PDB file of all heavy atoms in Angstrom:
ATOM      1  N   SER Z 102      -6.331 -21.066 -39.918  1.00 57.92           N
ATOM      2  CA  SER Z 102      -5.665 -21.742 -38.776  1.00 57.92           C
ATOM      3  C   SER Z 102      -6.781 -21.792 -37.664  1.00 57.92           C
ATOM      4  O   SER Z 102      -6.777 -22.780 -36.912  1.00 57.92           O
ATOM      5  CB  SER Z 102      -4.422 -21.266 -38.457  1.00 57.92           C
ATOM      6  OG  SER Z 102      -3.554 -21.351 -39.577  1.00 57.92           O
ATOM      7  N   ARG Z 103      -7.351 -20.659 -37.417  1.00 60.01           N
ATOM      8  CA  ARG Z 103      -8.237 -20.448 -36.350  1.00 60.01           C
ATOM      9  C   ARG Z 103      -9.513 -21.299 -36.453  1.00 60.01           C
ATOM     10  O   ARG Z 103      -9.841 -22.044 -35.420  1.00 60.01           O
ATOM     11  CB  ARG Z 103      -8.671 -19.013 -36.202  1.00 60.01           C
ATOM     12  CG  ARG Z 103      -7.614 -18.111 -35.602  1.00 60.01           C
ATOM     13  CD  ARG Z 103      -7.989 -16.661 -35.661  1.00 60.01           C
ATOM     14  NE  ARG Z 103      -9.452 -16.418 -35.123  1.00 60.01           N
ATOM     15  CZ  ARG Z 103      -9.937 -15.267 -35.412  1.00 60.01           C
ATOM     16  NH1 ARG Z 103      -9.339 -14.305 -36.194  1.00 60.01           N
ATOM     17  NH2 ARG Z 103     -11.240 -15.104 -35.073  1.00 60.01           N
ATOM     18  N   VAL Z 104     -10.066 -21.478 -37.606  1.00 59.72           N
ATOM     19  CA  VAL Z 104     -11.175 -22.327 -37.800  1.00 59.72           C
ATOM     20  C   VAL Z 104     -10.835 -23.805 -37.619  1.00 59.72           C
ATOM     21  O   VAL Z 104     -11.434 -24.655 -37.076  1.00 59.72           O
ATOM     22  CB  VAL Z 104     -11.894 -22.167 -39.203  1.00 59.72           C
ATOM     23  CG1 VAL Z 104     -10.908 -22.416 -40.261  1.00 59.72           C
ATOM     24  CG2 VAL Z 104     -13.172 -22.879 -39.255  1.00 59.72           C
ATOM     25  N   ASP Z 105      -9.620 -24.051 -38.105  1.00 58.17           N
ATOM     26  CA  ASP Z 105      -8.949 -25.351 -37.799  1.00 58.17           C
ATOM     27  C   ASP Z 105      -8.913 -25.644 -36.295  1.00 58.17           C
ATOM     28  O   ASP Z 105      -9.098 -26.846 -35.917  1.00 58.17           O
ATOM     29  CB  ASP Z 105      -7.637 -25.559 -38.536  1.00 58.17           C
ATOM     30  CG  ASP Z 105      -6.972 -26.796 -38.263  1.00 58.17           C
ATOM     31  OD1 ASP Z 105      -7.213 -27.771 -38.876  1.00 58.17           O
ATOM     32  OD2 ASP Z 105      -5.987 -26.794 -37.258  1.00 58.17           O
ATOM     33  N   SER Z 106      -8.543 -24.691 -35.548  1.00 54.82           N
ATOM     34  CA  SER Z 106      -8.413 -24.813 -34.042  1.00 54.82           C
ATOM     35  C   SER Z 106      -9.769 -25.079 -33.453  1.00 54.82           C
ATOM     36  O   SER Z 106      -9.843 -25.841 -32.467  1.00 54.82           O
ATOM     37  CB  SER Z 106      -7.835 -23.526 -33.560  1.00 54.82           C
ATOM     38  OG  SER Z 106      -6.559 -23.225 -34.163  1.00 54.82           O
ATOM     39  N   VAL Z 107     -10.857 -24.623 -34.018  1.00 53.19           N
ATOM     40  CA  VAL Z 107     -12.233 -24.953 -33.547  1.00 53.19           C
ATOM     41  C   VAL Z 107     -12.473 -26.435 -33.677  1.00 53.19           C
ATOM     42  O   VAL Z 107     -12.797 -27.054 -32.744  1.00 53.19           O
ATOM     43  CB  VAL Z 107     -13.291 -24.177 -34.478  1.00 53.19           C
ATOM     44  CG1 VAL Z 107     -14.666 -24.388 -33.715  1.00 53.19           C
ATOM     45  CG2 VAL Z 107     -12.855 -22.724 -34.622  1.00 53.19           C
ATOM     46  N   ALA Z 108     -12.204 -27.018 -34.828  1.00 46.20           N
ATOM     47  CA  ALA Z 108     -12.421 -28.463 -35.082  1.00 46.20           C
ATOM     48  C   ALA Z 108     -11.392 -29.255 -34.258  1.00 46.20           C
ATOM     49  O   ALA Z 108     -11.708 -30.318 -33.745  1.00 46.20           O
ATOM     50  CB  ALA Z 108     -11.967 -28.833 -36.584  1.00 46.20           C
ATOM     51  N   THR Z 109     -10.175 -28.597 -34.003  1.00 46.99           N
ATOM     52  CA  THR Z 109      -9.214 -29.219 -33.124  1.00 46.99           C
ATOM     53  C   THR Z 109      -9.722 -29.309 -31.694  1.00 46.99           C
ATOM     54  O   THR Z 109      -9.644 -30.494 -31.071  1.00 46.99           O
ATOM     55  CB  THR Z 109      -7.881 -28.425 -33.099  1.00 46.99           C
ATOM     56  OG1 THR Z 109      -7.351 -28.260 -34.354  1.00 46.99           O
ATOM     57  CG2 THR Z 109      -6.851 -28.981 -32.270  1.00 46.99           C
ATOM     58  N   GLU Z 110     -10.384 -28.220 -31.188  1.00 43.70           N
ATOM     59  CA  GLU Z 110     -10.892 -28.306 -29.778  1.00 43.70           C
ATOM     60  C   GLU Z 110     -12.138 -29.187 -29.807  1.00 43.70           C
ATOM     61  O   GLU Z 110     -12.459 -29.764 -28.855  1.00 43.70           O
ATOM     62  CB  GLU Z 110     -11.254 -26.967 -29.401  1.00 43.70           C
ATOM     63  CG  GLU Z 110     -11.574 -26.811 -27.870  1.00 43.70           C
ATOM     64  CD  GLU Z 110     -11.731 -25.239 -27.536  1.00 43.70           C
ATOM     65  OE1 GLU Z 110     -10.730 -24.511 -27.796  1.00 43.70           O
ATOM     66  OE2 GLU Z 110     -12.759 -24.977 -26.824  1.00 43.70           O
ATOM     67  N   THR Z 111     -12.857 -29.264 -30.915  1.00 42.67           N
ATOM     68  CA  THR Z 111     -14.113 -30.135 -31.007  1.00 42.67           C
ATOM     69  C   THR Z 111     -13.563 -31.649 -30.870  1.00 42.67           C
ATOM     70  O   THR Z 111     -14.195 -32.349 -30.126  1.00 42.67           O
ATOM     71  CB  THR Z 111     -14.655 -30.006 -32.333  1.00 42.67           C
ATOM     72  OG1 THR Z 111     -15.128 -28.603 -32.547  1.00 42.67           O
ATOM     73  CG2 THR Z 111     -15.725 -30.965 -32.579  1.00 42.67           C
ATOM     74  N   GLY Z 112     -12.454 -31.857 -31.439  1.00 43.14           N
ATOM     75  CA  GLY Z 112     -11.770 -33.224 -31.228  1.00 43.14           C
ATOM     76  C   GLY Z 112     -11.425 -33.549 -29.845  1.00 43.14           C
ATOM     77  O   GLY Z 112     -11.498 -34.637 -29.428  1.00 43.14           O
ATOM     78  N   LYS Z 113     -11.057 -32.510 -29.050  1.00 42.46           N
ATOM     79  CA  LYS Z 113     -10.692 -32.667 -27.611  1.00 42.46           C
ATOM     80  C   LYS Z 113     -11.993 -32.922 -26.876  1.00 42.46           C
ATOM     81  O   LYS Z 113     -11.949 -33.629 -25.843  1.00 42.46           O
ATOM     82  CB  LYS Z 113      -9.980 -31.462 -27.152  1.00 42.46           C
ATOM     83  CG  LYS Z 113      -8.790 -30.988 -27.943  1.00 42.46           C
ATOM     84  CD  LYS Z 113      -7.792 -32.212 -28.117  1.00 42.46           C
ATOM     85  CE  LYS Z 113      -6.516 -31.731 -28.830  1.00 42.46           C
ATOM     86  NZ  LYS Z 113      -5.724 -32.943 -29.183  1.00 42.46           N
ATOM     87  N   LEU Z 114     -13.059 -32.341 -27.252  1.00 42.60           N
ATOM     88  CA  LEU Z 114     -14.329 -32.617 -26.597  1.00 42.60           C
ATOM     89  C   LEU Z 114     -14.788 -34.163 -26.904  1.00 42.60           C
ATOM     90  O   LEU Z 114     -15.245 -34.741 -25.901  1.00 42.60           O
ATOM     91  CB  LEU Z 114     -15.380 -31.807 -27.139  1.00 42.60           C
ATOM     92  CG  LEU Z 114     -15.303 -30.252 -26.928  1.00 42.60           C
ATOM     93  CD1 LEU Z 114     -16.335 -29.346 -27.606  1.00 42.60           C
ATOM     94  CD2 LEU Z 114     -15.051 -29.932 -25.404  1.00 42.60           C
ATOM     95  N   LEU Z 115     -14.528 -34.590 -28.193  1.00 43.20           N
ATOM     96  CA  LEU Z 115     -14.980 -35.902 -28.500  1.00 43.20           C
ATOM     97  C   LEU Z 115     -13.967 -36.982 -27.734  1.00 43.20           C
ATOM     98  O   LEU Z 115     -14.275 -37.925 -27.302  1.00 43.20           O
ATOM     99  CB  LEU Z 115     -14.796 -35.998 -30.135  1.00 43.20           C
ATOM    100  CG  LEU Z 115     -15.741 -35.225 -30.814  1.00 43.20           C
ATOM    101  CD1 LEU Z 115     -15.472 -35.490 -32.309  1.00 43.20           C
ATOM    102  CD2 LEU Z 115     -17.235 -35.432 -30.522  1.00 43.20           C
ATOM    103  N   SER Z 116     -12.704 -36.462 -27.629  1.00 46.28           N
ATOM    104  CA  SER Z 116     -11.710 -37.183 -26.902  1.00 46.28           C
ATOM    105  C   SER Z 116     -12.218 -37.493 -25.422  1.00 46.28           C
ATOM    106  O   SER Z 116     -12.105 -38.496 -24.975  1.00 46.28           O
ATOM    107  CB  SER Z 116     -10.397 -36.410 -26.879  1.00 46.28           C
ATOM    108  OG  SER Z 116      -9.369 -37.071 -26.191  1.00 46.28           O
ATOM    109  N   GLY Z 117     -12.618 -36.427 -24.744  1.00 45.75           N
ATOM    110  CA  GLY Z 117     -13.095 -36.437 -23.391  1.00 45.75           C
ATOM    111  C   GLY Z 117     -14.397 -37.445 -23.373  1.00 45.75           C
ATOM    112  O   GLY Z 117     -14.560 -38.100 -22.320  1.00 45.75           O
ATOM    113  N   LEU Z 118     -15.173 -37.496 -24.377  1.00 48.81           N
ATOM    114  CA  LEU Z 118     -16.357 -38.277 -24.409  1.00 48.81           C
ATOM    115  C   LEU Z 118     -15.842 -39.787 -24.405  1.00 48.81           C
ATOM    116  O   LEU Z 118     -16.329 -40.654 -23.603  1.00 48.81           O
ATOM    117  CB  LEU Z 118     -17.210 -37.906 -25.610  1.00 48.81           C
ATOM    118  CG  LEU Z 118     -17.799 -36.557 -25.528  1.00 48.81           C
ATOM    119  CD1 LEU Z 118     -18.523 -36.343 -26.895  1.00 48.81           C
ATOM    120  CD2 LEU Z 118     -18.694 -36.403 -24.437  1.00 48.81           C
ATOM    121  N   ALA Z 119     -15.064 -40.029 -25.525  1.00 50.41           N
ATOM    122  CA  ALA Z 119     -14.631 -41.357 -25.736  1.00 50.41           C
ATOM    123  C   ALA Z 119     -13.859 -41.964 -24.493  1.00 50.41           C
ATOM    124  O   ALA Z 119     -13.848 -43.200 -24.296  1.00 50.41           O
ATOM    125  CB  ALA Z 119     -13.834 -41.455 -26.998  1.00 50.41           C
TER     126      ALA Z 119
END
Side-chain angles (χ1 to χ4, degrees):
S102 300
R103 282 170 52 197
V104 63
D105 176 79
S106 306
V107 191
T109 305
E110 194 172 308
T111 300
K113 305 308 180 186
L114 298 178
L115 301 178
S116 180
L118 299 176

